[PDB]
Design a protein around this nucleic acid. Structure first.
Ligand SMILES: NC(=O)c1ccc[n+]([C@@H]2O[C@H](COP(=O)([O-])OP(=O)(O)OC[C@H]3O[C@@H](n4cnc5c(N)ncnc54)[C@H](O)[C@@H]3O)[C@@H](O)[C@H]2O)c1
Ligand code: FES
Ligand SMILES: [K+]
Ligand SMILES: [K+]
Ligand SMILES: [K+]
Ligand SMILES: [K+]
Ligand SMILES: [K+]
Ligand SMILES: [K+]
Ligand SMILES: [K+]
Ligand SMILES: [K+]
Ligand SMILES: [K+]
Ligand SMILES: [K+]
Ligand SMILES: [K+]
Ligand SMILES: [Mg+2]
Ligand SMILES: [Mg+2]
Ligand SMILES: [Mg+2]
Ligand SMILES: [Mg+2]
Ligand SMILES: [Mg+2]
Ligand SMILES: [Mg+2]
Ligand SMILES: [Mg+2]
Ligand SMILES: [Mg+2]
Ligand SMILES: [Mg+2]
Ligand SMILES: [Mg+2]
Ligand SMILES: [Mg+2]
Ligand SMILES: [Mg+2]
Ligand SMILES: [Mg+2]
Ligand SMILES: [Mg+2]
Ligand SMILES: [Mg+2]
Ligand SMILES: [Mg+2]
Ligand SMILES: [Mg+2]
Ligand SMILES: [Mg+2]
Ligand SMILES: [Mg+2]
Ligand SMILES: [Mg+2]
Ligand SMILES: [Mg+2]
Ligand SMILES: [Mg+2]
Ligand SMILES: [Mg+2]
Ligand SMILES: [Mg+2]
Ligand SMILES: [Mg+2]
Lengths: 43, 51, 108, 110, 215, 168
RNA sequence: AUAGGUUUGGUCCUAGCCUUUCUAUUAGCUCUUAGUAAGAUUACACAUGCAAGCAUCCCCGUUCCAGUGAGUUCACCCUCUAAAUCACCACGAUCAAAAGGGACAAGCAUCAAGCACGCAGCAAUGCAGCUCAAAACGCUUAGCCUAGCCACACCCCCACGGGAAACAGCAGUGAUUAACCUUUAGCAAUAAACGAAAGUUUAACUAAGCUAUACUAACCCCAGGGUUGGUCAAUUUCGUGCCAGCCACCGCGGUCACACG
RNA sequence: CCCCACUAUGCUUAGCCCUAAACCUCAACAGUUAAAUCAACAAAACUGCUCGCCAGAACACUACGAGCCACAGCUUAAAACUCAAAG
RNA sequence: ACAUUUAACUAAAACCCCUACGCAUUUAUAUAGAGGAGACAAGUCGUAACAUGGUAAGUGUACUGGAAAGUGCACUUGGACGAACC
């Protein structure tokens, strides 16, 4: 779609942004089991 | 009523299209026959040259 | 340019209008710092009476004092207006005669 | 029948099919330039729910507005594929055509 | 276009609404009155000069019901303003009473009943208004029959009134223009419009309440 | 001079001369036309001259054009009900195509006159206000009425300055 | 634009700058009357007085009007549907929020990538997508599309809570700026609030005070300001002698200055 | 500037650097020679269409920001003050 | 982080949480000192350019020199070569 050079600063920043997302996705799932565990305890 | 008239107009134009296409094929077939005759001579003359 | 190019560029971007020495204001008040004279550029020759004032905006500028004879001294208040002195390069302000400490020129 | 979506019927070109059951469609409208008084295309992207995932990049489609948006950006659904990319049927004669040439002559079926 | 959320605006809003429900003033505080200056100490507002007399001489509704077995259920209560104005019997038949327990004398609260204004009994019971007014009077049991005796007068009233000058002329002109030839006089049917008195008890359920700001 | 061939097309006078005002049912108009061939000359002229006039009168109708997709040019209209009106335009001139769509999908002259008369009622001659909306701004403009004090000073008896002076 | 002056020894072309027209503020000098219109430089700090009451108690109102332009695509259309008015249950109409869709300022691309900005599924969860040179993401500037509308209401976007003690209501004051209206009257008209109402209240508003900022009409008395080399309407004689000074542009003044006094 | 001597360099191999008066200073494609041909000069004057670029001189093949195997570099590229000309 | 109670011959009562801001993060102003650019009636050294400007001028690049500039390599004419033969 676009024809723009991928220089170092962009390539490096894009790598982190993908890594940060992967690390955040995992946190979203670790705040799912903890909530599920507490709900099961109430019963 | 207007939509029915439009379809009728399209049908009339289609009948004119078929008539025009039929005439073009007759001319195409004629031109094709002449091209094939010319081609056949060229191939024969060229085949003899290589033989 | 072509019509496609004119559409993609759009109307001309008016170059921003530049604010002169008064910063788009009719007059400014100032405090006299020093009074001196300047020699005009060619082909003119004279000792034109100028002064350095600190304008209310905080900037200091050289301002030509018009008329024959002035009594301006340091620490005096004067009103300045636009209008360049065509002889003196870089003097773009003029002291107003008859306002605050600057008095009218004495007749003859 | 009433729908809260502004664009009720819009034709566009499929430009992306990487989302599940969602075809990304580019819709172009003619807009008058007030100075030149000439019409230039203005394009807008619409997400169209494709239940069967039968949309292909490059084919022309017709989008009907959904009664309410099913997603944040999906406000339309694929109503019909007007022209399939590479498999166009001439509406006038109903014959398969590749570009401006008939693949099957209209005179085959009279 | 994405509006930036204002969380403190929603936080304080919930806190305010809550405090208005927990620190709400009681009828004992709101409707108290200093009988010498004749001012409500809650807000420090003077009562109207026309109310000064009755405030000193008349009793509130629950200044009367607090002295009865079940806060006077199924008992008739009238008002001086009604006795002076209307000859026909006007009264409430009490059905429910929510007393204000914070009052040292249980002389404030609410009340429900069936209205009978000018001898016409309402079909359903509704909340009584002006319960905090110094206007009420309790009907003795031995006086109930005589007090409630009422004979409905004939309802003969005007049924049609003429249109005003101009409107009449404009309706007659349309008739002639359309071709209808008639000499009947156009008249407004005022039978549907039932003009009730200005002192008719209003709906207390739709009436507001004073806020908590104390003085 | 004005750029492009036939610059008259880029003038408000020319754009307002279109007589095709689609009915409210028409939503989309797809113009399929061929760039070459004698049988498509009218369709090419219709795209060159008449699409600007149609769009100018129908700003909310989407017009989309496709080049060299079929052996013959044709128009297709997508109506709000879901009906599709296919109009074959092969061999027809640009004037014939324009007259054809006016008949089958264009508002008649009576329908248009009515809409214009409804607009006339929006401006009431008797109403007073700013010149953008009304003919006259104040009653003082009407001859016979007391003129504006700015032009003709009022009598001292009618002026509040001296009304209270005579009384006190 | 009906154009004009100015590059050079001279010509033509290109080109910038300036002149002539019309408005608004401020300055100098000057200024007679009447009517009308308009009227802090500052979202800086404010002494004092007043600006919301009504009414048989409950309620209702003080959420409006008036003010300001700090911030700034909340204003427009459609869909849907609260509150409100139509006495009242209706009724539908009128009016108009929240929510949903669409549309909507300027400058800078030396702001070119944003960094979660998507979709599917009842859910679990799966997929890895979404925006962007047709200008995303950003920075800077500005109230606006003016029968009016939007935003704000001492600051912390908000206002539970903090700083702290608030005229961006009317009149007025200090500081500040080139920027400078009275610490008047009346609820009689209209408008708003309240009452069933006679009525009550209102610095909204109405009628006055001040000011050449503008318009209009006068004046028996009473005219000033600028300009006078060319562009551009109009200079006599002296003084000065590249000095003192002048100029919007080109320029003037070196002892006969239509250019300075 | 003239004479003599001798280096880097000119050559080969493998990687960089990415500039030129890289200008035939005359863009690509299609078409015309009709009329006022046409400021001047140069290599006659034009039409259709499209992309690129330019809006007084100087500051400035500069500063800053960003990218680059480039690190005394290249590409992109302003502003303030100044002038009534420059061309 | 945080709790479902009391009450119920009309029916109501009760309900109230804590976490930030630091000399951190952003953008400017001021400058020990170091430099440019432009302007500026009559200073100093040379004479690089305009004529074949006295070594034709210039472009890119490299090295060198008080200063303009010099030289190498390629390139340009925005130089010329006197225009029948001799
Ligand atoms: N920037 C893109 O990647 C892109 C994408 C689609 C279309 N285009 C088209 O490219 C043209 C230039 O656009 P601009 O002015 O924004 O670019 P530009 O010249 O300012 O350059 C900006 C960026 O676009 C790229 N670009 C430049 N010319 C391009 C071209 N012809 N095609 C593709 N990429 C190009 C450049 O490499 C650069 O990264 C326009 O016609 C535009 O429609 C560009
Ligand atoms: S504007 Fe009409 S009286 Fe003044
Ligand atoms: K001289
Ligand atoms: K001179
Ligand atoms: K000129
Ligand atoms: K003046
Ligand atoms: K503002
Ligand atoms: K605020
Ligand atoms: K009044
Ligand atoms: K180049
Ligand atoms: K060349
Ligand atoms: K030389
Ligand atoms: K030379
Ligand atoms: Mg001057
Ligand atoms: Mg409702
Ligand atoms: Mg809304
Ligand atoms: Mg920069
Ligand atoms: Mg670009
Ligand atoms: Mg602002
Ligand atoms: Mg304040
Ligand atoms: Mg606030
Ligand atoms: Mg004030
Ligand atoms: Mg003023
Ligand atoms: Mg007044
Ligand atoms: Mg003389
Ligand atoms: Mg003179
Ligand atoms: Mg060697
Ligand atoms: Mg060799
Ligand atoms: Mg070459
Ligand atoms: Mg090209
Ligand atoms: Mg270079
Ligand atoms: Mg550089
Ligand atoms: Mg750099
Ligand atoms: Mg220093
Ligand atoms: Mg020399
Ligand atoms: Mg030389
Ligand atoms: Mg050389
Ligand atoms: Mg050397």
């Amino acid at each position: 779609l676009y024809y723009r050079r991928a220089h170092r600063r962009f390539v490096t920043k894009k790598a982190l942004c993908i890594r940060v997302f992967q690390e955040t996705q995992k946190l979203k799932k670790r705040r799912r089991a903890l909530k599920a565990a507490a709900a099961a305890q109430k019963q | 009523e207007l939509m029915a008239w439009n379809q009728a107009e399209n049908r009339r134009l289609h009948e004119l299209r078929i008539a025009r296409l039929r005439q073009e094929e007759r001319e195409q077939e004629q031109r094709q026959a002449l091209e094939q005759a010319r081609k056949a001579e060229e191939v024969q003359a060229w085949a003899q040259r290589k033989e | 340019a072509t019509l496609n190019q004119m559409h993609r560029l759009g109307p001309p971007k008016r170059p921003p209008r530049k604010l002169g020495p008064t910063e788009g204001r009719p007059q400014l008040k100032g405090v006299v710092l020093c009074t001196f004279t300047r020699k005009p550029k060619k082909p003119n020759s004279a000792n034109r009476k100028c002064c350095r004032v600190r304008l209310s905006t905080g900037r200091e500028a050289v301002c030509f004092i018009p008329g024959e004879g002035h009594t301006l001294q340091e620490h005096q208040i004067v009103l300045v207006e636009g209008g360049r002195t065509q002889d003196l390069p870089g003097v773009k302000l003029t002291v107003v005669r008859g306002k605050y400490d600057c008095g009218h020129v004495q007749k003859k | 029948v009433r729908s809260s979506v502004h664009a009720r019927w819009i034709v566009g070109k499929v430009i992306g099919t990487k989302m599940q059951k969602t075809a990304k469609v580019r819709v172009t409208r003619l807009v008058l330039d007030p100075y030149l008084l000439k019409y230039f295309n203005k394009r807008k992207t619409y997400f169209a729910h494709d239940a069967l995932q039968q949309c292909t990049v490059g084919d022309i489609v017709l989008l009907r507005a959904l009664p309410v948006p099913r997603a944040k950006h999906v406000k339309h659904e694929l109503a019909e594929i007007v022209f399939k990319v590479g498999k166009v049927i001439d509406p006038v004669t109903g014959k398969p055509c590749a570009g401006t040439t008939y693949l099957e002559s209209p005179l085959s079926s009279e | 276009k994405k509006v930036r959320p204002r969380l403190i605006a929603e936080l304080a809003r919930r806190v305010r609404a809550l405090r208005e429900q927990l620190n709400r003033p009681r009828d004992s505080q709101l409707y108290a009155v200093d009988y010498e200056t004749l001012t409500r100490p809650f807000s420090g507002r003077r009562l109207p000069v026309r109310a000064w007399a009755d405030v000193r001489r008349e009793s509130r509704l629950l200044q009367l019901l607090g002295r009865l077995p079940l806060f006077g259920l199924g008992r008739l209560v009238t008002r001086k303003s009604w006795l002076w104005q209307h000859d026909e019997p006007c009264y409430w038949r009490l059905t429910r009473v929510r007393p204000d327990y914070t009052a040292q004398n249980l002389d404030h609260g609410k009340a429900w009943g069936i209205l009978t204004f000018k001898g016409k009994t309402e079909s359903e019971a509704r909340e009584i208004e002006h319960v905090m007014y110094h206007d009420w009077r309790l009907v003795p049991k031995h006086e109930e029959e005589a007090f409630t005796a009422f004979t409905p007068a004939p309802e003969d009233s005007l049924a049609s009134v003429p249109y005003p000058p101009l409107l009449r002329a404009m309706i007659i002109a349309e008739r002639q223009k359309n071709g209808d030839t008639s000499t009947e006089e156009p008249m407004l049917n005022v039978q549907r419009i039932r003009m009730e008195p200005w002192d008719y008890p209003a709906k207390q359920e739709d009436k507001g309440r004073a806020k908590g700001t104390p003085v | 001079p004005m750029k492009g061939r036939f610059p008259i097309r880029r003038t408000l006078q020319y754009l307002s001369q279109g007589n095709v005002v689609f009915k409210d049912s028409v939503k989309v108009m797809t113009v399929n036309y061929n760039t070459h061939g004698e049988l498509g000359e009218g369709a090419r002229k219709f795209v060159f001259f008449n699409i600007p006039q149609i769009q100018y009168k129908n700003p909310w109708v989407q017009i989309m054009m496709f080049k060299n997709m079929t052996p013959s040019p044709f128009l297709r209209f997508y109506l709000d009900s879901g009906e599709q009106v296919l109009v074959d335009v092969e061999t027809k001139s640009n004037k014939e195509i324009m007259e054809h769509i006016r008949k089958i999908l264009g508002k008649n002259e009576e329908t248009l006159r009515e809409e214009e008369e409804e607009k006339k009622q929006l401006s009431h001659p008797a109403n007073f206000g700013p010149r953008k909306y009304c003919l006259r701004e104040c009653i003082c403009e009407v001859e016979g009425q007391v003129p504006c004090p700015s032009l003709v000073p009022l009598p001292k008896e009618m002026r509040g300055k001296y009304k209270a002076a005579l009384k006190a």
